[PDB]
Write a protein that binds this ligand. Structure first.
Ligand SMILES: OC[C@H]1O[C@@H](O[C@H]2[C@H](O)[C@@H](O)[C@@H](O)O[C@@H]2CO)[C@H](O)[C@@H](O)[C@H]1O
Length: 626
């Protein structure tokens, strides 16, 4: 339970306690609600709106559900309650579901699925007999009446958008669709954009972008789609693309990019795709996720939440929040408390305060808690100042022949330099440390010695959540090194390992008893090349892209460098990077070397940025700057 220092919370929508105005046959009554689910928390012009399911009788998905809203004009001290949308009232189990919310001006656009009488889960329905898809538009107006600031919201009659759903898509016959739940966006050209989950007559699930250029009068689907198996998509716009982050049951979450309103989808292999696991071993159901772009203290970042689900199934305990600038991926920490069940969530950033509406579940009775994320916003601002300082400090270095090109920070993701503890080498970017053994701190890095010496920067080793999954598609690992002793055989100095030992490599660099380098390319025959001297430091660059590895000493490729390291159409799964040894006592090499300033970029640096880092190795360390 990390609800941070100075952060606190209330139980806003109290299961079996909070009442709503329930309407039926021309009569409104105050009704105690069983469970509140599917939190959507937004800002309309300074009115904090909280939208959710009111699951009246039971938390069963297929039961009687209206869309409730609660709205506050004082940043969630007091709230007014209403029912935003009501179901058909056609049976005891009629329902409007997966409320998905777009804010635009003083308007709230809410899309829901609607079901009349089925008790089966929607993905199992072989047709659309019980289903409709409805947009209701709520309008917020703002008074300062009788002295104090007041507000209300008038909700419109839902309008069916079923006319806008084609009966065919590529290679399939359509079935039903719903919003991804949570909060959607207005694009920077003004369009309304819902990422939606859709099923076909084969009952497969897959995600699309459903949009409107006309304030919601009419609706299109992007031509493209996600893989099958992708559900509850949640989307934001980042630097002119849509980022569509999807739930994938029993798998790691797939993230996609689309630069043309969803006409073409490319998997975001270089950044965020397959980063987040739905459970420790990613073999459990996943979750709805809050996924938004904000500007905090002048930097555009993204915020993402998803339960860790230690418990497995749909329990979905331990809601975590993540920060990213589409390069570094920082775990802010756990928002929910202890081991409580805590599946959906909605993060709002408003007037430079952070808030989160999330579920808590005990025994299938759900409340939505409203939390003030003050400590979290503090951690975030600190991590961001850190990102800003290192990028600015690296980028103002005057690189030598006054000045050559700046040290590149585009795509720099991790940085091991001057800070280290007794057993860890610290990421200056503060997201992923390397563990160490037999490590002696020297300026801007470590000196390693003896069997099992070295550092380990985890890749797949990060566990359920893998920030460095990009490395499987491209990376550049850079480092200054010095060999202090002539090894007895070939010893490692640096590389990306595919297994836990370091014995099955993707790409690495070793050095041998003959004073030669042994760059290693996958499982290819190793060929010693070049020459070094005990005591001279050297600059080393490993790049991999397009399934091609290359090794540089002092800014210059080794002879025969640029070989195939991925020997077929399967994607590697890198376990970790090893630095200055294997950091394994089972591996019988002894690397006696010093390694300074390890940089990890999410791309193949080009000739010039490699030559700049080389000539700049003495200027980039963190040493002076702490
Ligand atoms: O546990 C509450 C959640 O149930 C999920 O439905 C599961 C169900 O729990 C499981 O026991 C079995 O029947 O499979 C269902 C999926 O087809 C719902 O998906 C989820 O939304 C919660 O209500």
């Amino acid at each position: 339970a990390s609800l941070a220092p100075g952060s606190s919370r209330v139980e806003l929508f109290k299961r079996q306690s909070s009442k709503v105005p329930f309407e039926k046959d021309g009569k409104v009554t105050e009704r105690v609600v069983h469970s509140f689910r599917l939190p959507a928390l937004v800002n309309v012009d300074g009115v904090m709106v909280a939208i959710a399911d009111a699951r009246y009788e039971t938390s069963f998905d297929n039961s009687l559900i209206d869309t409730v809203a609660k709205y506050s004009v004082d940043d969630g001290e007091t709230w007014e309650t209403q029912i935003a949308i009501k179901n058909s009232r056609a049976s005891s189990v009629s329902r409007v579901v997966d409320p998905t919310v777009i804010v635009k001006g003083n308007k709230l656009y809410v899309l829901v699925g609607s079901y009349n009488s089925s008790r089966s889960y929607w993905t199992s329905h072989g047709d659309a007999r019980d289903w409709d898809i409805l947009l209701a538009v709520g309008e917020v107006t703002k008074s300062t009446a009788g002295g104090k600031i007041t507000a209300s919201i008038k909700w419109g009659s839902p309008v069916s958008l079923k006319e806008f759903f084609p009966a065919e898509m590529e290679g399939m016959h359509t079935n039903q669709f719903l919003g991804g739940a949570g909060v959607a966006i207005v694009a920077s050209n003004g369009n309304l954009v819902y990422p939606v989950q859709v099923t076909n007559k084969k009952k497969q699930v897959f995600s699309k972008i459903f949009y409107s250029e006309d304030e919601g009068k009419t609706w299109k689907f992007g031509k493209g789609r996600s893989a099958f198996g992708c559900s509850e998509p949640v989307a934001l716009e980042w630097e002119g693309k849509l980022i569509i982050n999807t739930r994938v049951d029993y798998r790691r979450r797939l993230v996609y990019e689309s630069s043309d309103m969803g006409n073409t989808w490319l998997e975001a292999v270089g950044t965020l795709s397959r980063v987040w696991g739905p459970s420790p071993k990613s073999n459990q159901p996943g979750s709805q996720s809050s996924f938004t772009a904000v500007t905090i203290e002048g930097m555009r970042v993204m915020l993402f939440t998803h339960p860790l689900n230690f418990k497995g199934r749909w329990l979905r305990d331990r809601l975590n929040l993540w920060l990213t600038d589409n390069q570094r991926i920082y775990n802010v920490g756990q928002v929910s408390i202890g081991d409580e069940n805590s599946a959906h969530s909605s993060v709002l950033y408003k007037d430079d305060k952070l808030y989160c509406l999330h579920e808590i579940n005990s025994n299938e009775v759900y409340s939505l808690v409203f939390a003030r994320l003050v400590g979290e916003l503090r951690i975030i601002k600190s991590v961001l100042q850190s990102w800003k300082n290192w990028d600015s400090h690296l980028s103002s270095i005057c690189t030598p022949a006054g000045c050559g090109p700046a040290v590149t920070t585009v795509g720099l993701v991790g940085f091991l330099s001057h800070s280290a503890t007794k057993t860890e080498w610290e990421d200056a970017y503060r997201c992923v440390n390397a563990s160490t053994a037999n490590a002696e701190r020297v300026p801007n890095g470590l000196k390693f010695a003896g069997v099992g010496g070295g550092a380990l920067w985890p890749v797949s080793q990060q566990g359920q959540n893998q920030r460095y999954h990009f490395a499987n598609h491209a990376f550049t690992l850079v480092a200054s090194v010095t060999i202090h002793e002539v090894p007895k055989g070939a010893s490692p100095l640096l590389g990306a390992s595919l297994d836990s030992s370091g014995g099955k490599k993707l790409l690495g660099l070793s050095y041998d008893k003959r004073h030669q380098w042994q760059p290693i390319y996958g499982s290819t025959p190793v060929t010693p090349t070049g020459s070094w001297e005990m005591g001279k430091r050297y600059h080393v660059v490993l790049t991999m892209a397009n399934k091609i590895g290359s090794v540089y000493i002092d800014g210059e490729p080794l002879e025969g460098s640029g070989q195939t390291v991925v020997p077929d159409e399967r994607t590697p799964d890198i376990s970790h990077f090893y630095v200055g040894g294997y950091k394994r006592s089972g591996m019988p090499t002894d690397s006696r070397v010093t390694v300074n300033n390890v940089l990890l970029y999410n791309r193949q640096l080009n000739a010039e940025e490699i030559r700049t880092l080389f000539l700049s190795q003495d200027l980039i360390g963190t040493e002076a700057h702490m």
